[PDB]
Amino acid sequence: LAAQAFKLLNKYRPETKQEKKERLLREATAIKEVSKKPYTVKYGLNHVVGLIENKKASLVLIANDVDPIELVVFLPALCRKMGIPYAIIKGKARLGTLVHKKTAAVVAITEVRSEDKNELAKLISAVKEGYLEKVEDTRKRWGGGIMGFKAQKREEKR
Amino acid sequence: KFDQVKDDQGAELAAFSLEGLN
Amino acid sequence: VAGLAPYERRVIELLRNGKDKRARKFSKKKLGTFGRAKRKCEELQRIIAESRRAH
Amino acid sequence: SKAAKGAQAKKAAQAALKGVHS
Amino acid sequence: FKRAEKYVKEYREQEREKIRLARIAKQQGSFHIPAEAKLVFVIRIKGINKIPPKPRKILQLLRLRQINNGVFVKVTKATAEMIKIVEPWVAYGYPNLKSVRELIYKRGYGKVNGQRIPLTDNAIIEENLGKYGIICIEDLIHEIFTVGPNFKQAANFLWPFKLSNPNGGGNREEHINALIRAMN
Amino acid sequence: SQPGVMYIARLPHGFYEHELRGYFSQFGEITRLRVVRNKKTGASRHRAFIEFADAEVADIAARTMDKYLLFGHILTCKIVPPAQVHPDLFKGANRRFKVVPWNKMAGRQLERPLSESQWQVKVAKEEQRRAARAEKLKEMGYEFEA
Amino acid sequence: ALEKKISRALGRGDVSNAARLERNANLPEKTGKPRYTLNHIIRERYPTFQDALRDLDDCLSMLFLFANLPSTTAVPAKMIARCER
Amino acid sequence: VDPDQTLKACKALLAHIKKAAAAPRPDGKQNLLADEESTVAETPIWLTLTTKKHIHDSHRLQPGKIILPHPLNTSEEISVCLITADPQRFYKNAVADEFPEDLRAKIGRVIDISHLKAKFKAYEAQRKLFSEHDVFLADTRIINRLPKALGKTFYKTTTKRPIPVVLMAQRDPLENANARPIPEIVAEIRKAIGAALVHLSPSTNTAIKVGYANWEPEKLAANIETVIRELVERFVPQKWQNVRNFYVKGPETAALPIYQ
Amino acid sequence: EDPYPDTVEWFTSVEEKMPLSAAPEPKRRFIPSKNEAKQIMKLVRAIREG
RNA sequence: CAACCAUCAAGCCCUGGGCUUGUGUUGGGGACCCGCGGCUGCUCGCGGGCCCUGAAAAGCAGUGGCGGGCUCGCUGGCGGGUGCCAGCCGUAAAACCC
């Protein structure tokens, strides 16, 4: 699931600064000597949470290692109540490499072009079944309890 | 100046063209 | 997402068991004002009702 | 026998779910 | 450890390759080239991990197994059929005179008694061939460029050329010259 | 020795017979396999049943492969409970399901000529069905002379 | 630091930024010319064109060796071609 | 073949079609989107050809076209979808320039093969396009590519299949398409739009469209007679030696026989 | 008393069908970008000045 | 888990229009209509027509063989089997391979 999502996200990765300035110069020279809405992955905590609140998001990806963790605690729950499918991937580094940055907290897919309606819907269904139900049966509990041998002996002696 | 087509066919030393005055 | 404080959970247990007077007294002792105690009992009561509906 | 089969099946599941690289 | 994506991809590759091979086998082996025999140098590139039996035997005849192998060949009817059969794995075209000269001079090895010795000595060249009309490495070069009756023997004697792997440098008539300086 | 039966549905095209064999054997020993196909035209109908030697490794494969996106197909690999396990689930296991060109044969029995007795039998059948056709078509208001 | 940056680009998958990074690199595999500018050091080494002619012995011998020799990873075919020219 | 019996059979079958259409549907329960006149109309009457041997030859199996004296196509409200090899932009430019009367009105969409492969690879997408458009045209350079880009539900199942056209005058697609000129393109397209399609099946039975019941019996008789001559003379192997039964059939009723 | 209890999704059990904000969408989300328009104009100025 | 058929060919007629050889397509279901093969027959196959269908899903797998492989014996040779072949064809046998 991570790999397929990364494939689609890479096919929709945002334009970098070099090629953005290049296309701006393209347009300027065209003015010297016709397009549709750009579809690109939306990034940014506040932007994505507002998009989810307005139900403009089709899929939500959440970094698992946001070192202020409060920035995310409410995000899976708000996604669940809103209805937008959500998943939690390993690496704010991969989020920041999907975008052309060092790190990103959340990644949203809202709308894509015609050619990949099918694979967008298929990825949405795949996640909302095979990760959503799997971690939905068991997510209302408390984790931990990984005591080792020395921990067991110490607790027995205590 | 040396010409690429003749060099490719195998001119070698003959490929280069020398002009006494600039 | 956050849950309940220890005293909030204590008052929740009291209200579920039916000791409304005891819950109100405990809330007053923890908060310091009758109005705040009444209000907190109110949110906790709608939380209990919403949990019952959800179940 | 049975333990070895279980171990190899668990290894295959781990390889399929997490990869082999590192 | 190997995965279902690879299983499916390999099976589809095999299926499509089998379909295309059957297509050529059923169709007439007539290429849009004049009936004259030509000279074409062919370099094989790793396209598919697993190869069907007919392309495998063709590659066996063309001795192109070790990585980055190339060899000269006569463009005729049967050879064109074999090339069209092995099309995905081979990249081929007309060599240049400078290209063949540089190839033979930089990378030249002689096959004697199942041994691969470099073309250091015309004495070795003649102790190998001797009586067929070859007199030196330049004689072999001229034979290869202007094919003679001894072309098959010359091709058998010369070891297949092992081109260096390039770092980024169907049929095309002429760009094989650029590719041969790229891998040379 | 309790074998484990696992049913795999929503098979992507081509992940069929030696593909299931190889991948599920790379998990562990497979005793039987059968991907069901269509007798009319040789082609899998996208579901299969496999039988592992051990129900435990069957369970492992089931949970590790159950929800798996492969080539746009979300496979469904779930353990067939031992209670049902129909006896004839692997009647055609381990054997080809060959592509039989029934259309080609049918055309070729048509193209072989027949004997005179067979011809007159065909004539009798054809004239009987001509009479039936005339009977059912008269109510429309048409009568063909021939 | 520039190979560090091109490794940055290759690891992140930014093919276009990697292309500009190698453009700035001007690597002597496509270049055929020296990767570095040695004009100042050759000036310091050879105060006179007479000394340049004196070292032309090894210069010409070794470059003709390289004109004859085939290419390897360290010595690209392009730079051998330039030596031949 | 006898035109008097052909005409009377077509008259009787068409009359039965009107009676069947006028007969109320038994549940005492009516429709919105079908007035009685339109219910009688848009009903295909066709002819099925049954022969005596298997039709093995590949380009006998290949779809062909026949110039029918009255255009088989209604040209009333249907949409035709055309498939282009290269500059999509150029062919939209051409349809925007050339002819406003009928080509604007019947050409609903036109798609380059690259855009078709990119936008319609989903079974849902191909089925939706099949339902959306009414008849299809494509260039001979694209006909052989269609079976893989468009699935069985588009090609194998229904007679609603693309008709080959020639966008050939006698590589970089941005540079220049190699196409024959626009008015003659329009002529080829009108021929294809009105040109009855013939698809042959490997077995000994095939079905060919001949017309719609709302026409008149003499038009139907002339059209079917020309269809018979063209089929018997151009496509079927062993022209008069393999020939057999022709049945004139309506939408849901029986068929009327003629023997050859 | 169970110390660490399972959380009951009393509020999130109900999926909300509708977006939160009724504020009308501004024109900028349906018209092209004047920010890039001004940037293109500045680049044209720079090109004209050379 | 990329893309990768001829993004036009070759041959013809009556030289200017075309024609011809260029095989390729998910799987199901409907208490709907038709044609041909068989079945004494119900019916079953093949081919159509009209609909429903996320690239959907719970045995029903049935028709004859060539070679090849794994075998059982007699003398590397010969004769019977095979829910074996990522090989072929269609009733024969050949082809392929080495």
PDB file of N, CA and C in Angstrom, chain E residues 110-159:
ATOM      1  N   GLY E 110      42.028 -13.441 -30.269  1.00  0.00           N
ATOM      2  CA  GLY E 110      42.023 -14.583 -31.168  1.00  0.00           C
ATOM      3  C   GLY E 110      41.623 -15.851 -30.433  1.00  0.00           C
ATOM      4  N   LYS E 111      40.869 -16.700 -31.127  1.00  0.00           N
ATOM      5  CA  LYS E 111      40.392 -17.960 -30.568  1.00  0.00           C
ATOM      6  C   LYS E 111      41.214 -19.107 -31.147  1.00  0.00           C
ATOM      7  N   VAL E 112      42.027 -19.740 -30.305  1.00  0.00           N
ATOM      8  CA  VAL E 112      42.780 -20.932 -30.679  1.00  0.00           C
ATOM      9  C   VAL E 112      42.670 -21.953 -29.553  1.00  0.00           C
ATOM     10  N   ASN E 113      42.310 -23.187 -29.909  1.00  0.00           N
ATOM     11  CA  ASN E 113      42.218 -24.296 -28.956  1.00  0.00           C
ATOM     12  C   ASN E 113      41.356 -23.929 -27.751  1.00  0.00           C
ATOM     13  N   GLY E 114      40.279 -23.191 -28.005  1.00  0.00           N
ATOM     14  CA  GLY E 114      39.422 -22.730 -26.926  1.00  0.00           C
ATOM     15  C   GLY E 114      40.102 -21.771 -25.974  1.00  0.00           C
ATOM     16  N   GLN E 115      40.979 -20.914 -26.491  1.00  0.00           N
ATOM     17  CA  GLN E 115      41.674 -19.919 -25.689  1.00  0.00           C
ATOM     18  C   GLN E 115      41.524 -18.551 -26.339  1.00  0.00           C
ATOM     19  N   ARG E 116      41.465 -17.519 -25.495  1.00  0.00           N
ATOM     20  CA  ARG E 116      41.209 -16.148 -25.930  1.00  0.00           C
ATOM     21  C   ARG E 116      42.466 -15.311 -25.671  1.00  0.00           C
ATOM     22  N   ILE E 117      43.316 -15.211 -26.689  1.00  0.00           N
ATOM     23  CA  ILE E 117      44.559 -14.446 -26.597  1.00  0.00           C
ATOM     24  C   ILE E 117      44.411 -13.155 -27.393  1.00  0.00           C
ATOM     25  N   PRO E 118      45.010 -12.052 -26.948  1.00  0.00           N
ATOM     26  CA  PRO E 118      44.874 -10.789 -27.680  1.00  0.00           C
ATOM     27  C   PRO E 118      45.599 -10.828 -29.017  1.00  0.00           C
ATOM     28  N   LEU E 119      45.127  -9.985 -29.937  1.00  0.00           N
ATOM     29  CA  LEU E 119      45.704  -9.889 -31.280  1.00  0.00           C
ATOM     30  C   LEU E 119      46.975  -9.040 -31.223  1.00  0.00           C
ATOM     31  N   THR E 120      47.944  -9.534 -30.451  1.00  0.00           N
ATOM     32  CA  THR E 120      49.195  -8.806 -30.279  1.00  0.00           C
ATOM     33  C   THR E 120      50.107  -8.966 -31.491  1.00  0.00           C
ATOM     34  N   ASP E 121      50.120 -10.149 -32.102  1.00  0.00           N
ATOM     35  CA  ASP E 121      51.117 -10.479 -33.108  1.00  0.00           C
ATOM     36  C   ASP E 121      50.460 -10.939 -34.403  1.00  0.00           C
ATOM     37  N   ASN E 122      50.914 -10.341 -35.508  1.00  0.00           N
ATOM     38  CA  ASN E 122      50.558 -10.859 -36.824  1.00  0.00           C
ATOM     39  C   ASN E 122      51.095 -12.271 -37.011  1.00  0.00           C
ATOM     40  N   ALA E 123      52.202 -12.595 -36.335  1.00  0.00           N
ATOM     41  CA  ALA E 123      52.695 -13.967 -36.340  1.00  0.00           C
ATOM     42  C   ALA E 123      51.672 -14.917 -35.733  1.00  0.00           C
ATOM     43  N   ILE E 124      51.048 -14.517 -34.621  1.00  0.00           N
ATOM     44  CA  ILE E 124      49.973 -15.316 -34.038  1.00  0.00           C
ATOM     45  C   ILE E 124      48.785 -15.380 -34.988  1.00  0.00           C
ATOM     46  N   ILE E 125      48.449 -14.247 -35.613  1.00  0.00           N
ATOM     47  CA  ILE E 125      47.343 -14.208 -36.569  1.00  0.00           C
ATOM     48  C   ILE E 125      47.548 -15.243 -37.669  1.00  0.00           C
ATOM     49  N   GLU E 126      48.777 -15.349 -38.174  1.00  0.00           N
ATOM     50  CA  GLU E 126      49.025 -16.233 -39.308  1.00  0.00           C
ATOM     51  C   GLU E 126      49.223 -17.677 -38.867  1.00  0.00           C
ATOM     52  N   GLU E 127      49.809 -17.899 -37.690  1.00  0.00           N
ATOM     53  CA  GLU E 127      49.834 -19.247 -37.133  1.00  0.00           C
ATOM     54  C   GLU E 127      48.419 -19.756 -36.893  1.00  0.00           C
ATOM     55  N   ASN E 128      47.467 -18.839 -36.705  1.00  0.00           N
ATOM     56  CA  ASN E 128      46.074 -19.246 -36.563  1.00  0.00           C
ATOM     57  C   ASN E 128      45.428 -19.508 -37.920  1.00  0.00           C
ATOM     58  N   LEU E 129      45.413 -18.511 -38.807  1.00  0.00           N
ATOM     59  CA  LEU E 129      44.749 -18.683 -40.096  1.00  0.00           C
ATOM     60  C   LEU E 129      45.719 -19.132 -41.184  1.00  0.00           C
ATOM     61  N   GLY E 130      46.704 -18.297 -41.500  1.00  0.00           N
ATOM     62  CA  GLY E 130      47.795 -18.678 -42.376  1.00  0.00           C
ATOM     63  C   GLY E 130      47.499 -18.783 -43.858  1.00  0.00           C
ATOM     64  N   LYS E 131      46.774 -19.832 -44.253  1.00  0.00           N
ATOM     65  CA  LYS E 131      46.688 -20.203 -45.661  1.00  0.00           C
ATOM     66  C   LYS E 131      45.422 -19.709 -46.346  1.00  0.00           C
ATOM     67  N   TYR E 132      44.536 -19.013 -45.633  1.00  0.00           N
ATOM     68  CA  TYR E 132      43.271 -18.609 -46.231  1.00  0.00           C
ATOM     69  C   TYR E 132      43.374 -17.316 -47.029  1.00  0.00           C
ATOM     70  N   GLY E 133      44.544 -16.688 -47.071  1.00  0.00           N
ATOM     71  CA  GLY E 133      44.727 -15.421 -47.755  1.00  0.00           C
ATOM     72  C   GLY E 133      44.904 -14.235 -46.836  1.00  0.00           C
ATOM     73  N   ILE E 134      44.710 -14.403 -45.532  1.00  0.00           N
ATOM     74  CA  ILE E 134      44.934 -13.348 -44.552  1.00  0.00           C
ATOM     75  C   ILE E 134      46.437 -13.205 -44.357  1.00  0.00           C
ATOM     76  N   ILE E 135      46.911 -11.965 -44.239  1.00  0.00           N
ATOM     77  CA  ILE E 135      48.321 -11.711 -44.009  1.00  0.00           C
ATOM     78  C   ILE E 135      48.576 -10.924 -42.726  1.00  0.00           C
ATOM     79  N   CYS E 136      47.569 -10.245 -42.173  1.00  0.00           N
ATOM     80  CA  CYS E 136      47.748  -9.490 -40.942  1.00  0.00           C
ATOM     81  C   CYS E 136      46.402  -9.067 -40.369  1.00  0.00           C
ATOM     82  N   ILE E 137      46.479  -8.346 -39.247  1.00  0.00           N
ATOM     83  CA  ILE E 137      45.286  -7.786 -38.621  1.00  0.00           C
ATOM     84  C   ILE E 137      44.607  -6.799 -39.560  1.00  0.00           C
ATOM     85  N   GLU E 138      45.397  -5.999 -40.281  1.00  0.00           N
ATOM     86  CA  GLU E 138      44.815  -5.096 -41.269  1.00  0.00           C
ATOM     87  C   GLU E 138      44.157  -5.874 -42.403  1.00  0.00           C
ATOM     88  N   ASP E 139      44.713  -7.037 -42.751  1.00  0.00           N
ATOM     89  CA  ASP E 139      44.065  -7.894 -43.740  1.00  0.00           C
ATOM     90  C   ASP E 139      42.708  -8.377 -43.238  1.00  0.00           C
ATOM     91  N   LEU E 140      42.633  -8.780 -41.966  1.00  0.00           N
ATOM     92  CA  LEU E 140      41.341  -9.136 -41.384  1.00  0.00           C
ATOM     93  C   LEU E 140      40.386  -7.948 -41.388  1.00  0.00           C
ATOM     94  N   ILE E 141      40.902  -6.754 -41.088  1.00  0.00           N
ATOM     95  CA  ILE E 141      40.074  -5.550 -41.078  1.00  0.00           C
ATOM     96  C   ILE E 141      39.475  -5.308 -42.455  1.00  0.00           C
ATOM     97  N   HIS E 142      40.303  -5.410 -43.497  1.00  0.00           N
ATOM     98  CA  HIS E 142      39.817  -5.177 -44.851  1.00  0.00           C
ATOM     99  C   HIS E 142      38.830  -6.259 -45.270  1.00  0.00           C
ATOM    100  N   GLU E 143      39.076  -7.510 -44.873  1.00  0.00           N
ATOM    101  CA  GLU E 143      38.116  -8.572 -45.166  1.00  0.00           C
ATOM    102  C   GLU E 143      36.761  -8.279 -44.534  1.00  0.00           C
ATOM    103  N   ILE E 144      36.761  -7.892 -43.256  1.00  0.00           N
ATOM    104  CA  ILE E 144      35.510  -7.610 -42.560  1.00  0.00           C
ATOM    105  C   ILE E 144      34.787  -6.437 -43.211  1.00  0.00           C
ATOM    106  N   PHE E 145      35.518  -5.360 -43.516  1.00  0.00           N
ATOM    107  CA  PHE E 145      34.876  -4.199 -44.126  1.00  0.00           C
ATOM    108  C   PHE E 145      34.335  -4.527 -45.514  1.00  0.00           C
ATOM    109  N   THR E 146      35.173  -5.084 -46.383  1.00  0.00           N
ATOM    110  CA  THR E 146      34.747  -5.603 -47.673  1.00  0.00           C
ATOM    111  C   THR E 146      34.763  -7.122 -47.587  1.00  0.00           C
ATOM    112  N   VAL E 147      33.626  -7.683 -47.171  1.00  0.00           N
ATOM    113  CA  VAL E 147      33.442  -9.123 -47.042  1.00  0.00           C
ATOM    114  C   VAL E 147      34.008  -9.883 -48.237  1.00  0.00           C
ATOM    115  N   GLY E 148      34.694 -10.985 -47.938  1.00  0.00           N
ATOM    116  CA  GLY E 148      35.163 -11.911 -48.939  1.00  0.00           C
ATOM    117  C   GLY E 148      34.681 -13.316 -48.643  1.00  0.00           C
ATOM    118  N   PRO E 149      35.211 -14.304 -49.370  1.00  0.00           N
ATOM    119  CA  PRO E 149      34.803 -15.696 -49.107  1.00  0.00           C
ATOM    120  C   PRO E 149      35.216 -16.203 -47.734  1.00  0.00           C
ATOM    121  N   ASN E 150      36.179 -15.548 -47.088  1.00  0.00           N
ATOM    122  CA  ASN E 150      36.730 -15.995 -45.815  1.00  0.00           C
ATOM    123  C   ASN E 150      36.081 -15.315 -44.615  1.00  0.00           C
ATOM    124  N   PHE E 151      34.949 -14.636 -44.820  1.00  0.00           N
ATOM    125  CA  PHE E 151      34.329 -13.875 -43.739  1.00  0.00           C
ATOM    126  C   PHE E 151      33.874 -14.781 -42.604  1.00  0.00           C
ATOM    127  N   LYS E 152      33.328 -15.953 -42.931  1.00  0.00           N
ATOM    128  CA  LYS E 152      32.881 -16.868 -41.885  1.00  0.00           C
ATOM    129  C   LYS E 152      34.050 -17.326 -41.023  1.00  0.00           C
ATOM    130  N   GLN E 153      35.169 -17.681 -41.656  1.00  0.00           N
ATOM    131  CA  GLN E 153      36.346 -18.101 -40.903  1.00  0.00           C
ATOM    132  C   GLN E 153      36.890 -16.960 -40.054  1.00  0.00           C
ATOM    133  N   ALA E 154      36.905 -15.742 -40.602  1.00  0.00           N
ATOM    134  CA  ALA E 154      37.368 -14.596 -39.825  1.00  0.00           C
ATOM    135  C   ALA E 154      36.471 -14.349 -38.617  1.00  0.00           C
ATOM    136  N   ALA E 155      35.154 -14.434 -38.806  1.00  0.00           N
ATOM    137  CA  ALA E 155      34.230 -14.236 -37.695  1.00  0.00           C
ATOM    138  C   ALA E 155      34.414 -15.310 -36.632  1.00  0.00           C
ATOM    139  N   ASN E 156      34.618 -16.559 -37.056  1.00  0.00           N
ATOM    140  CA  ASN E 156      34.868 -17.629 -36.096  1.00  0.00           C
ATOM    141  C   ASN E 156      36.164 -17.390 -35.332  1.00  0.00           C
ATOM    142  N   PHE E 157      37.204 -16.912 -36.020  1.00  0.00           N
ATOM    143  CA  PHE E 157      38.490 -16.714 -35.361  1.00  0.00           C
ATOM    144  C   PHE E 157      38.439 -15.567 -34.359  1.00  0.00           C
ATOM    145  N   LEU E 158      37.898 -14.417 -34.762  1.00  0.00           N
ATOM    146  CA  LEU E 158      37.827 -13.281 -33.850  1.00  0.00           C
ATOM    147  C   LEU E 158      36.872 -13.566 -32.696  1.00  0.00           C
ATOM    148  N   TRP E 159      37.327 -13.268 -31.482  1.00  0.00           N
ATOM    149  CA  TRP E 159      36.490 -13.410 -30.304  1.00  0.00           C
ATOM    150  C   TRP E 159      35.409 -12.328 -30.302  1.00  0.00           C
TER     151      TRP E 159
END
